[PDB]
Structures are given as structure tokens and as C-alpha cells.
Amino acid sequence: ADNKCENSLRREIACGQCRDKVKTDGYFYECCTSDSTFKKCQDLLH
């Protein structure tokens, strides 16, 4: 994949709390897979 939760947990944490506070542990895959989204999640987690 094009960079996923295999890099720095810095992005994994975001997606986590993100799709974990708005969606579920079944959506965290969206960011973990897509980066464009992670940028939208981290923006909220801050």
C-alpha cells in the first residue's frame, strides 16, 4: 500500500482516535490505507 500504519505510529494514533470517536474500529482502515484522509483526521485530533 502507499504508506500505511507501518510507518510512524504518529499517523496510526490519529486514524485511531479519529475513526474511533466518530466512526468505529472498522473505519480506521480508511486512513491507515489512504493518506489524504489521515490528513483530515489528524486535523481533528491535533
PDB file of N, CA, C and O in Angstrom:
ATOM      1  N   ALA A   1       0.861  -1.216   0.000  1.00  0.00           N
ATOM      2  CA  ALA A   1       0.000   0.000   0.000  1.00  0.00           C
ATOM      3  C   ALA A   1       0.882   1.244   0.000  1.00  0.00           C
ATOM      4  O   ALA A   1       2.085   1.164   0.245  1.00  0.00           O
ATOM      5  N   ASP A   2       0.275   2.394  -0.277  1.00  0.00           N
ATOM      6  CA  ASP A   2       1.015   3.649  -0.309  1.00  0.00           C
ATOM      7  C   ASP A   2       1.187   4.209   1.101  1.00  0.00           C
ATOM      8  O   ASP A   2       0.488   5.143   1.497  1.00  0.00           O
ATOM      9  N   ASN A   3       2.121   3.637   1.852  1.00  0.00           N
ATOM     10  CA  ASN A   3       2.378   4.089   3.214  1.00  0.00           C
ATOM     11  C   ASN A   3       1.140   3.900   4.084  1.00  0.00           C
ATOM     12  O   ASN A   3       0.100   4.512   3.839  1.00  0.00           O
ATOM     13  N   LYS A   4       1.263   3.049   5.096  1.00  0.00           N
ATOM     14  CA  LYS A   4       0.150   2.781   5.999  1.00  0.00           C
ATOM     15  C   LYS A   4       0.603   2.878   7.453  1.00  0.00           C
ATOM     16  O   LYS A   4       1.561   3.585   7.767  1.00  0.00           O
ATOM     17  N   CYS A   5      -0.088   2.164   8.338  1.00  0.00           N
ATOM     18  CA  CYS A   5       0.258   2.177   9.756  1.00  0.00           C
ATOM     19  C   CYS A   5       1.575   1.442   9.996  1.00  0.00           C
ATOM     20  O   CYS A   5       1.876   1.043  11.122  1.00  0.00           O
ATOM     21  N   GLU A   6       2.357   1.266   8.934  1.00  0.00           N
ATOM     22  CA  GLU A   6       3.638   0.579   9.044  1.00  0.00           C
ATOM     23  C   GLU A   6       4.761   1.579   9.307  1.00  0.00           C
ATOM     24  O   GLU A   6       5.851   1.202   9.734  1.00  0.00           O
ATOM     25  N   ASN A   7       4.486   2.854   9.052  1.00  0.00           N
ATOM     26  CA  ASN A   7       5.481   3.898   9.267  1.00  0.00           C
ATOM     27  C   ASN A   7       5.526   4.298  10.739  1.00  0.00           C
ATOM     28  O   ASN A   7       5.695   3.453  11.617  1.00  0.00           O
ATOM     29  N   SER A   8       5.374   5.593  11.002  1.00  0.00           N
ATOM     30  CA  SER A   8       5.398   6.090  12.371  1.00  0.00           C
ATOM     31  C   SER A   8       3.999   6.059  12.972  1.00  0.00           C
ATOM     32  O   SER A   8       3.028   6.463  12.331  1.00  0.00           O
ATOM     33  N   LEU A   9       3.900   5.575  14.205  1.00  0.00           N
ATOM     34  CA  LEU A   9       2.615   5.494  14.882  1.00  0.00           C
ATOM     35  C   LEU A   9       1.972   6.874  14.985  1.00  0.00           C
ATOM     36  O   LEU A   9       0.837   7.007  15.440  1.00  0.00           O
ATOM     37  N   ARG A  10       2.702   7.899  14.559  1.00  0.00           N
ATOM     38  CA  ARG A  10       2.192   9.261  14.609  1.00  0.00           C
ATOM     39  C   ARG A  10       0.891   9.373  13.821  1.00  0.00           C
ATOM     40  O   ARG A  10      -0.019  10.106  14.206  1.00  0.00           O
ATOM     41  N   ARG A  11       0.814   8.646  12.713  1.00  0.00           N
ATOM     42  CA  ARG A  11      -0.379   8.675  11.875  1.00  0.00           C
ATOM     43  C   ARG A  11      -1.389   7.625  12.335  1.00  0.00           C
ATOM     44  O   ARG A  11      -2.599   7.785  12.149  1.00  0.00           O
ATOM     45  N   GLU A  12      -0.878   6.554  12.934  1.00  0.00           N
ATOM     46  CA  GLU A  12      -1.735   5.478  13.418  1.00  0.00           C
ATOM     47  C   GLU A  12      -2.586   5.953  14.585  1.00  0.00           C
ATOM     48  O   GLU A  12      -3.745   5.560  14.719  1.00  0.00           O
ATOM     49  N   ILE A  13      -2.012   6.805  15.423  1.00  0.00           N
ATOM     50  CA  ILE A  13      -2.741   7.319  16.573  1.00  0.00           C
ATOM     51  C   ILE A  13      -3.917   8.156  16.105  1.00  0.00           C
ATOM     52  O   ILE A  13      -5.033   8.025  16.605  1.00  0.00           O
ATOM     53  N   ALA A  14      -3.655   9.016  15.135  1.00  0.00           N
ATOM     54  CA  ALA A  14      -4.688   9.875  14.589  1.00  0.00           C
ATOM     55  C   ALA A  14      -5.872   9.048  14.118  1.00  0.00           C
ATOM     56  O   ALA A  14      -6.945   9.060  14.725  1.00  0.00           O
ATOM     57  N   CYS A  15      -5.655   8.328  13.035  1.00  0.00           N
ATOM     58  CA  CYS A  15      -6.681   7.475  12.462  1.00  0.00           C
ATOM     59  C   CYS A  15      -7.423   6.746  13.563  1.00  0.00           C
ATOM     60  O   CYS A  15      -8.648   6.621  13.533  1.00  0.00           O
ATOM     61  N   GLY A  16      -6.667   6.271  14.537  1.00  0.00           N
ATOM     62  CA  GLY A  16      -7.258   5.557  15.651  1.00  0.00           C
ATOM     63  C   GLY A  16      -8.333   6.403  16.326  1.00  0.00           C
ATOM     64  O   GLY A  16      -9.521   6.270  16.033  1.00  0.00           O
ATOM     65  N   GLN A  17      -7.903   7.279  17.230  1.00  0.00           N
ATOM     66  CA  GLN A  17      -8.829   8.150  17.947  1.00  0.00           C
ATOM     67  C   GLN A  17      -9.870   8.717  16.986  1.00  0.00           C
ATOM     68  O   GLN A  17     -11.053   8.853  17.322  1.00  0.00           O
ATOM     69  N   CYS A  18      -9.418   9.045  15.782  1.00  0.00           N
ATOM     70  CA  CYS A  18     -10.300   9.603  14.771  1.00  0.00           C
ATOM     71  C   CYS A  18     -11.499   8.695  14.517  1.00  0.00           C
ATOM     72  O   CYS A  18     -12.570   8.920  15.067  1.00  0.00           O
ATOM     73  N   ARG A  19     -11.320   7.681  13.673  1.00  0.00           N
ATOM     74  CA  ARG A  19     -12.410   6.766  13.348  1.00  0.00           C
ATOM     75  C   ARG A  19     -12.881   6.001  14.577  1.00  0.00           C
ATOM     76  O   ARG A  19     -13.732   5.117  14.477  1.00  0.00           O
ATOM     77  N   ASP A  20     -12.331   6.350  15.732  1.00  0.00           N
ATOM     78  CA  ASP A  20     -12.708   5.690  16.972  1.00  0.00           C
ATOM     79  C   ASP A  20     -13.602   6.596  17.818  1.00  0.00           C
ATOM     80  O   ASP A  20     -14.205   6.139  18.790  1.00  0.00           O
ATOM     81  N   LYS A  21     -13.685   7.875  17.444  1.00  0.00           N
ATOM     82  CA  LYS A  21     -14.514   8.823  18.184  1.00  0.00           C
ATOM     83  C   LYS A  21     -15.706   9.254  17.339  1.00  0.00           C
ATOM     84  O   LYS A  21     -16.721   9.705  17.870  1.00  0.00           O
ATOM     85  N   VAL A  22     -15.575   9.109  16.022  1.00  0.00           N
ATOM     86  CA  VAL A  22     -16.642   9.476  15.108  1.00  0.00           C
ATOM     87  C   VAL A  22     -17.259   8.231  14.474  1.00  0.00           C
ATOM     88  O   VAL A  22     -18.479   8.136  14.335  1.00  0.00           O
ATOM     89  N   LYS A  23     -16.407   7.280  14.091  1.00  0.00           N
ATOM     90  CA  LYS A  23     -16.876   6.042  13.475  1.00  0.00           C
ATOM     91  C   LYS A  23     -16.648   4.859  14.407  1.00  0.00           C
ATOM     92  O   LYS A  23     -17.104   4.861  15.550  1.00  0.00           O
ATOM     93  N   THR A  24     -15.945   3.847  13.913  1.00  0.00           N
ATOM     94  CA  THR A  24     -15.671   2.663  14.716  1.00  0.00           C
ATOM     95  C   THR A  24     -14.304   2.087  14.366  1.00  0.00           C
ATOM     96  O   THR A  24     -13.597   2.618  13.509  1.00  0.00           O
ATOM     97  N   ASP A  25     -13.937   1.000  15.036  1.00  0.00           N
ATOM     98  CA  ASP A  25     -12.651   0.361  14.789  1.00  0.00           C
ATOM     99  C   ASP A  25     -12.663  -0.369  13.450  1.00  0.00           C
ATOM    100  O   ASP A  25     -11.751  -1.138  13.146  1.00  0.00           O
ATOM    101  N   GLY A  26     -13.698  -0.120  12.654  1.00  0.00           N
ATOM    102  CA  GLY A  26     -13.819  -0.759  11.347  1.00  0.00           C
ATOM    103  C   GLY A  26     -13.561   0.242  10.228  1.00  0.00           C
ATOM    104  O   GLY A  26     -13.477  -0.129   9.057  1.00  0.00           O
ATOM    105  N   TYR A  27     -13.437   1.513  10.597  1.00  0.00           N
ATOM    106  CA  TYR A  27     -13.186   2.562   9.616  1.00  0.00           C
ATOM    107  C   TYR A  27     -11.727   3.004   9.664  1.00  0.00           C
ATOM    108  O   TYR A  27     -11.204   3.526   8.693  1.00  0.00           O
ATOM    109  N   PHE A  28     -11.080   2.793  10.800  1.00  0.00           N
ATOM    110  CA  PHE A  28      -9.683   3.171  10.958  1.00  0.00           C
ATOM    111  C   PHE A  28      -8.859   2.676   9.775  1.00  0.00           C
ATOM    112  O   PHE A  28      -7.739   3.123   9.556  1.00  0.00           O
ATOM    113  N   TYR A  29      -9.419   1.751   9.014  1.00  0.00           N
ATOM    114  CA  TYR A  29      -8.713   1.214   7.859  1.00  0.00           C
ATOM    115  C   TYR A  29      -8.669   2.242   6.731  1.00  0.00           C
ATOM    116  O   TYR A  29      -7.752   2.237   5.909  1.00  0.00           O
ATOM    117  N   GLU A  30      -9.663   3.125   6.703  1.00  0.00           N
ATOM    118  CA  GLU A  30      -9.727   4.155   5.675  1.00  0.00           C
ATOM    119  C   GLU A  30      -8.452   4.978   5.662  1.00  0.00           C
ATOM    120  O   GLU A  30      -7.815   5.124   4.621  1.00  0.00           O
ATOM    121  N   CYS A  31      -8.072   5.523   6.816  1.00  0.00           N
ATOM    122  CA  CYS A  31      -6.872   6.327   6.873  1.00  0.00           C
ATOM    123  C   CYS A  31      -5.634   5.451   6.773  1.00  0.00           C
ATOM    124  O   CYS A  31      -4.760   5.692   5.942  1.00  0.00           O
ATOM    125  N   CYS A  32      -5.557   4.443   7.634  1.00  0.00           N
ATOM    126  CA  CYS A  32      -4.407   3.552   7.635  1.00  0.00           C
ATOM    127  C   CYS A  32      -4.019   3.172   6.207  1.00  0.00           C
ATOM    128  O   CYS A  32      -2.868   2.841   5.935  1.00  0.00           O
ATOM    129  N   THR A  33      -4.994   3.214   5.299  1.00  0.00           N
ATOM    130  CA  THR A  33      -4.742   2.863   3.905  1.00  0.00           C
ATOM    131  C   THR A  33      -4.526   4.115   3.062  1.00  0.00           C
ATOM    132  O   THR A  33      -3.581   4.192   2.278  1.00  0.00           O
ATOM    133  N   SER A  34      -5.410   5.093   3.228  1.00  0.00           N
ATOM    134  CA  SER A  34      -5.308   6.338   2.476  1.00  0.00           C
ATOM    135  C   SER A  34      -4.666   7.427   3.329  1.00  0.00           C
ATOM    136  O   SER A  34      -4.985   7.572   4.510  1.00  0.00           O
ATOM    137  N   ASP A  35      -3.759   8.187   2.725  1.00  0.00           N
ATOM    138  CA  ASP A  35      -3.076   9.258   3.442  1.00  0.00           C
ATOM    139  C   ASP A  35      -3.903  10.540   3.411  1.00  0.00           C
ATOM    140  O   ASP A  35      -3.997  11.253   4.409  1.00  0.00           O
ATOM    141  N   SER A  36      -4.500  10.827   2.258  1.00  0.00           N
ATOM    142  CA  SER A  36      -5.315  12.026   2.108  1.00  0.00           C
ATOM    143  C   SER A  36      -6.302  12.156   3.265  1.00  0.00           C
ATOM    144  O   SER A  36      -6.543  13.254   3.768  1.00  0.00           O
ATOM    145  N   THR A  37      -6.868  11.029   3.681  1.00  0.00           N
ATOM    146  CA  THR A  37      -7.829  11.027   4.778  1.00  0.00           C
ATOM    147  C   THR A  37      -7.134  11.321   6.105  1.00  0.00           C
ATOM    148  O   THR A  37      -7.588  12.161   6.881  1.00  0.00           O
ATOM    149  N   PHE A  38      -6.030  10.624   6.358  1.00  0.00           N
ATOM    150  CA  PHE A  38      -5.282  10.820   7.595  1.00  0.00           C
ATOM    151  C   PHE A  38      -5.067  12.306   7.862  1.00  0.00           C
ATOM    152  O   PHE A  38      -5.125  12.756   9.007  1.00  0.00           O
ATOM    153  N   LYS A  39      -4.817  13.063   6.799  1.00  0.00           N
ATOM    154  CA  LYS A  39      -4.593  14.498   6.933  1.00  0.00           C
ATOM    155  C   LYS A  39      -5.852  15.191   7.445  1.00  0.00           C
ATOM    156  O   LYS A  39      -5.781  16.257   8.056  1.00  0.00           O
ATOM    157  N   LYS A  40      -7.002  14.575   7.193  1.00  0.00           N
ATOM    158  CA  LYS A  40      -8.271  15.141   7.636  1.00  0.00           C
ATOM    159  C   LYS A  40      -8.584  14.703   9.062  1.00  0.00           C
ATOM    160  O   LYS A  40      -9.293  15.395   9.794  1.00  0.00           O
ATOM    161  N   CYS A  41      -8.051  13.550   9.451  1.00  0.00           N
ATOM    162  CA  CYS A  41      -8.280  13.027  10.792  1.00  0.00           C
ATOM    163  C   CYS A  41      -7.360  13.709  11.801  1.00  0.00           C
ATOM    164  O   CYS A  41      -7.808  14.183  12.844  1.00  0.00           O
ATOM    165  N   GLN A  42      -6.072  13.757  11.479  1.00  0.00           N
ATOM    166  CA  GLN A  42      -5.094  14.385  12.355  1.00  0.00           C
ATOM    167  C   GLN A  42      -5.484  15.831  12.633  1.00  0.00           C
ATOM    168  O   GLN A  42      -5.234  16.355  13.718  1.00  0.00           O
ATOM    169  N   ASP A  43      -6.101  16.471  11.644  1.00  0.00           N
ATOM    170  CA  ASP A  43      -6.523  17.858  11.793  1.00  0.00           C
ATOM    171  C   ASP A  43      -7.480  17.998  12.968  1.00  0.00           C
ATOM    172  O   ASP A  43      -7.496  19.021  13.652  1.00  0.00           O
ATOM    173  N   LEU A  44      -8.278  16.961  13.197  1.00  0.00           N
ATOM    174  CA  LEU A  44      -9.236  16.978  14.293  1.00  0.00           C
ATOM    175  C   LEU A  44      -8.561  16.584  15.600  1.00  0.00           C
ATOM    176  O   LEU A  44      -8.709  17.265  16.613  1.00  0.00           O
ATOM    177  N   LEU A  45      -7.828  15.475  15.574  1.00  0.00           N
ATOM    178  CA  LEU A  45      -7.146  15.005  16.769  1.00  0.00           C
ATOM    179  C   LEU A  45      -6.212  16.080  17.303  1.00  0.00           C
ATOM    180  O   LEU A  45      -6.218  16.384  18.494  1.00  0.00           O
ATOM    181  N   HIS A  46      -5.406  16.650  16.415  1.00  0.00           N
ATOM    182  CA  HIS A  46      -4.472  17.690  16.825  1.00  0.00           C
ATOM    183  C   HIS A  46      -3.781  17.298  18.128  1.00  0.00           C
ATOM    184  O   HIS A  46      -2.573  17.454  18.207  1.00  0.00           O
TER     185      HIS A  46
END
